[PDB]
Every structure is written in C-alpha cells, then in structure tokens.
Amino acid sequence: SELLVNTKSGKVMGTRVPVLSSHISAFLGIPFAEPPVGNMRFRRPEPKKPWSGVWNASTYPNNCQQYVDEQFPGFSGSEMWNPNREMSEDCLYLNIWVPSPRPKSTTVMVWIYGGGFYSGSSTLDVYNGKYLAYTEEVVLVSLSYRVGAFGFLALHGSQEAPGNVGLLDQRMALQWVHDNIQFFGGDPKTVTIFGESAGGASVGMHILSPGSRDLFRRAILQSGSPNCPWASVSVAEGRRRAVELGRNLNCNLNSDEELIHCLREKKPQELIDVEWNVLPFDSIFRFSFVPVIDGEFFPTSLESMLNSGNFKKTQILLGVNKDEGSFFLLYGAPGFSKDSESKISREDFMSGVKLSVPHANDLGLDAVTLQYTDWMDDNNGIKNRDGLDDIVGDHNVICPLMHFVNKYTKFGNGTYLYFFNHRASNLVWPEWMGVIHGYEIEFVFGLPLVKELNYTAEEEALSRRIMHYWATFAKTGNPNEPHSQESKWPLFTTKEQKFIDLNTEPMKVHQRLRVQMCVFWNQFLPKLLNAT
C-alpha cells in the first residue's frame, strides 16, 4: 500500500490528504527519539526503540511545552503561531508529506520551526507541507525539538543538563531522515534543511557543528543566522540563568545535582511560569534558554569558526524581510500598540533604543541614537517608529545575517540572497508593522494557492515563484531553472554582493544590502563597546 511504509524503526501507516483538488500521502507524528520525560528531562535525546506492529501516522503529534501567546485573545495574527495540539514533554516527532504516486528518489526538504528557541510547533497551519510537496514534487519533512528550559537549560560540565539538547533533537531527526527517507521515496543525498528565525539560526548552527554537517546537502535560512545576538549565550551566562531559574522555584542550589533534581520534579508549567524572569537585562528580542557555546556542539566561538572556514561548505539560500523588528516592539516597547499607528515620542524612542541594545553602555546608546535619528526632524513620530523598527531588525536579524553571508561566501560553493518586501493584502496586523518577521513563511509554503485564504492572483504567482526557487535550489543548488526565459537570480559574490527583491513586481537586482547600517552594527559598535 502507498500509505504503508517500512522503516528501520518499524512500519508506519499514513493518510491520504486532499491538496488543491488532488491528493498526496501524509505521515504525521512519527517518533524519532525516546520521550524525553522524567529523569530524561534536560538530557540529550535517545533514539527511538523500534516498535512492533504498525505505527498510526494519521494524526499530528503533540507540541512541545512552551510559553503560549495570550497577548491578543481570539486574534488570528498571534494565535496562528500558538500550539494547535496538546502540549506535552512527549513531543519528539516528525511529519512527512509524500507525492502521489510515491516517488522513487526525490529531493527532500526538512523544515525547522522558529520561535526564539522558547516556542514553536511543527503542526501550524502555515507549516502544512502538502502544498509544497504537491506543487514541487519534493518530500517535505518537518521536525520538532524541545524549546524553553526543556531544550536549552545549560549547566556546563553536567551530563544531566549539558545544554543544546534541542539542537541534538533536531540532529536526531536529521539522522532519522538520513537513515529512513529512502523508504518514503526521498533521496538522502539531496536533503535541504530550511527554517525561519530560530530555525534559520538552527540551520546555520548545523552548518557550523561538525556533528551535524554530514546529515544534509544544502541549507536555506530565513530571517535568522547562527551568529545572531539572541541565538546563543556563553556557558557562564547559561549557568547563571539555570541557577536563577532554580532560585525562582525555591530550589536547593548547592550543586548541579541538587538543582537539576529540583527542576525535574517541577511540572512543565511551573518552569514556564518563571522562564522570563532569568533574563539579565530589560530587553526585547532576547530569550531565556538558547543554544550555548559549549566547546562540544560548537568547537570554538562562532566568529572564529566563521573566520577560519570551520564549517560545512555547500550552497546556501538566505534572506530577510523588510520590517523584522516590528513584532518585538509591538510586544515589548513602550508606545507601540496593535490598534494605533504607534507614532513614537522622543521619550519612547529613547526607551526603545535601550531595550533594543540592552548590552550597550550610554556611549553605545548614543551611537545608535545618532545613527538612526533624522536631526532635521527629530519629533517625527513616524520616523521614530520606523527608526526603532529598523534598529531592532538591523541589529537582531539583517546585519548578523549579512555578517554570516559575507564570512560564508568566502569558503562556500554558492550563495543566493533575497530581500522579501511584499506586504500581504490579507494581513491582519496593522499597517505600521510592514513586512513582518515570519510573514514570508506562508508564501514559502504556498498558502496563497488556496483560494479561500483571500490572496490576490499576483500573490499566488509570487508564492509559486518562491516555492519553485526554493525547491529548484533544494534539487540543484541553484534557484534558477536552467535554460529558462524568466529573470535570473544572480549568485551572491564577495565582489559584487548582489541580491534580489521578492515581491509581486518584476525582479530587481541590488547590491550591498543595508551595508551602511551593517558596518555600524558589525564593525563600529562592537569596537566602541569593547573599548569602553
């Protein structure tokens, strides 16, 4: 049967799902690890013991335990990102969409969800792999991984809570795809990993980690890169936050053993209730438990790895959105509101700068403020709002990504860079937020092909274009069809630094994406902070 697949771990039974007036096979909730529950909380994942019988893979699995966004109850803009399945520590599963009839050996794409390493679900409507698998005839995988303290609590030196175990969750799913996707018609030698935000940083982290490089062919990173200021902490900061967490829960803090045992006795929501209290600064775009620079998953610092070429050399496709910052200002900066234009007073602007660069001294705040203030019109509330927007996105997403892309292209085998700046016509968020963090995903997964979702015909064309860029890149290492008459997406090179816009207008090619601000964020400001 087409819905029955024999794997090295056992048989699985999928389900036939409709898609665009056709059908494909879906294998939902396949386990790839032992449930990381009980005494295994905070530990590295173990591989799933093979099973007898037929595993029912007809339904979506549980989502991992996470903080849940209640800032706008009933509002689809925020709740479409919340878990849409019961939460459970028993959450290490993956999902596969397979073209029908079953392919023999086809291109594989593995989706890694974002969410600041504190949240995320493989089961969201916007991650439904059936449109991409059907349209582009790829085998689409989405994995899952522990977030929050459950995935990233780091007590370096301990083997019970070493840190990075959510990254190892991802790697074990990658190992499982490598070992088993051939049975689903996937080609294990042509696996592209792709992800957005924390998932894009994750993709970059598997590019860097020697233990991960061999498990995939090429990589796509959307609005995230491994060197992002929020994506990792040192071993000392990870230890400090773990101890502060136990301090929030009245834990014996005498030893790692005491602390871990206390934290393992707590119910999941107890950890989530206090998770945000361990941040060291009054900040935005900073998350409590994230990957740790441990000398094991990451052999040395990220910057020295990037400088020495210590990373997998292959092709990469990556990009950013126009207004990456607006989401985080909405949720955490004074003066921003969902239902107003959020014109920003000068006081509020200064408050925003401080939340945005929480590690900066007062001279650093001044440097940032000078760089982003039109002093001919300092009380322009729209310029203050857009200026804060740019600060948050430049510092947290665009300029770290530009630093990564420039270090990587020196040693890599091909780079394609995009600037996604289409505001969707059916967007439920306010105008001022612009082209929001995460809102290219629905185009990458082909949601505008579904008529009931109220996109324009031009947006369907843009989605089909992006889906084909991405799958063609996954298949060949080049998003362009050979001998095609459509406009070509030029390679990004050290010399020319070309990129394209992604929108409903005819493709335009630019160079040196936001280079003025990224020189400030990547060269000048770190020098200023290190000297003062």
Ligand X SMILES: O/N=C/c1nc(CCCCCN2CCOCC2)ccc1O
Ligand Y SMILES: *[C@@H]1O[C@H](CO)[C@@H](O)[C@H](O)[C@H]1NC(C)=O
Instruction: Tell me: does residue 414 bind ligand Y (CB under 6 A).
Output: yes
Tell me which stretch binds ligand Y (CB under 6 A): 149-157, 249-257, 446-454, 511-519. 446-454
The nearest distance, CB 378 to ligand X, in angstroms, is: 28
- Residue 498's φ and ψ, nearest 5 degrees, are -80, 150
Give every CB contact of residue 18 below 8 A, 6+ residues apart in sequence: none
Q: Is 428 in the site for its own copies (CB under 8 A)?
A: no
Minimum CB distance to ligand X smaller for 311 or for 429? 429
If one asks whether residue 258 binds its own copies (CB under 8 A), the answer comes out as no
367 binds, among its own copies, ligand X, ligand Y, none (CB under 5 to 8 A by kind): its own copies
Length of the chain counted residue by residue = 532
Candidate segments 18-26, 179-187, 294-302, 512-520, binder of its own copies by CB under 8 A? 512-520
Q: Would you count residue 340 as binding its own copies (CB under 8 A)?
A: no
CB of 88 to ligand Y, least distance (A): 16
339 binds, among its own copies, ligand X, ligand Y, none (CB under 5 to 8 A by kind): none
Stretch in the footprint of ligand Y (CB under 6 A) among 89-97, 186-194, 237-245, 447-455: 447-455
**Using the rule CB under 8 A, is 367 a contact of its own copies?**
yes
Taking CB atoms, the residue at the shortest distance from ligand X is 327
Decide if 42 contacts 50 (C-beta within 8 A).
no
**């760089």: which residue's tokens?**
371
Closest CA to 238 of 313, 296, 186: 296
Residue 5 contacts residue 35 (beta carbons within 8 Å): no
Residue 379 engages its own copies in binding (rule: CB under 8 A): no
239 burial level (CB within 10 Å; 0-12, 13-18, 19+): buried
- Choice between 59 and 255, CB closer to ligand Y: 59
The yes or no reply on residue 100 touching ligand Y (CB under 6 A) is no
Q: Which is nearer to ligand Y, 56 or 269 (CB)?
A: 56
Cα–Cα distance between 216 and 384 in angstroms, integer?
Answer: 43
Does 509 interact with its own copies (rule: CB under 8 A)?
Answer: no
- Rule CB under 8 A: is residue 365 a binding residue for its own copies? no
How far apart are CB 69 and ligand X at their closest, in Å?
7
Is there a catalytic annotation at residue 303? no
Q: Residue 454, interface with ligand Y (CB under 6 A)? A: yes
Site for its own copies contains 276 (CB under 8 A):
no
Find the part of the chain contacting its own copies (CB under 8 A) among 7-15, 234-242, 273-281, 521-529: 521-529
**Phi and psi at residue 338, to the nearest 5°:** -65, -30
Q: Pick from 94, 192, 96: which is nearest to 143 by CA?
A: 94
Rule CB under 8 A: say whether 511 interacts with its own copies: yes
Looking at beta carbons only, is 118 or 127 nearer to ligand Y?
127
Residue 195: name the closest of 232, 164, 226, 222 by CA. Answer: 222
Return all residues near 83 (Cβ < 8 A) that are at least 6 apart.
63, 66, 68, 121, 123
**Site map (CB under 6 A) of ligand Y, residues 38-57, x = contact:** ------------------x-
139-142 and 106-112 beta bridge pairing: parallel
- Gap between the Cα atoms of 138 and 131, Å rounded: 10
Q: Is 437 a catalytic residue?
A: yes
| Contact by Cβ (8 Å): 455, 424 | yes
Residues 270, 347, 366, 496: which binds its own copies (CB under 8 A)?
366
516 binds, among its own copies, ligand Y, ligand X, none (CB under 5 to 8 A by kind): its own copies
- Which position among 68, 453, 515, 529 is part of the footprint of ligand Y (CB under 6 A)? 453
Which residues are registered as beta bridge partners of 416?
317
Q: Which of 516, 233, 229, 524 is nearest to 390 (CA)?
A: 516
| Residue 81 binds its own copies, judged by CB under 8 A | no
Q: Does 58 bind ligand Y (CB under 6 A)?
A: yes
β-bridge partners, 501: 419
Q: Quick one: how many helices (H) and strands (E) in the chain?
A: 18, 14
Where do contacts with ligand X occur on this chain (CB under 6 A)?
114-116, 197-198, 276, 327-328, 331, 437-438
Q: Are 195 and 221 in contact (CB under 8 A)?
A: yes
By CB under 8 A, name the one of 20, 235, 491, 528 that touches its own copies: 528
183 binds, among ligand X, its own copies, ligand Y, none (CB under 5 to 8 A by kind): none
Quick one: 80 or 87, whose CB is closer to ligand Y?
Answer: 80
Element housing 97 (H / E): strand 93-98
Sign of the four-CA dihedral 303, 307, 309, 313: positive
| Half-sphere exposure for 35 (CA within 13 Å, toward CB) | 12
Looking at the DSSP bridge assignments, the partners of residue 154 are 162
Q: Which is nearer to ligand X, 133 or 272 (CB)?
A: 272
CB of 460 to its own copies, least distance (A): 34
State the alpha helices, DSSP H only, in 181-213: 198-208
Q: Which of 71, 413, 425, 523 binds ligand Y (CB under 6 A)?
A: 413
Buried b (16+ CB within 10 A) or exposed e, 160-195: bbbbbbbbbbbbbbbbbbbbbbbebbbbbebbbbbb
What's the min distance (Å) between Cβ of 362 and ligand X?
25
Cα separation of 147 and 288, whole Å? 10
Binding residues for its own copies, rule: CB under 8 A, are 363, 366-367, 370, 374-376, 511-512, 515-516, 519-520, 523-524, 527-528, 531-532
Q: Which residues are catalytic?
A: 197, 324, 437
Binding residues for ligand Y, rule: CB under 6 A, are 56, 58-59, 413-414, 452-454
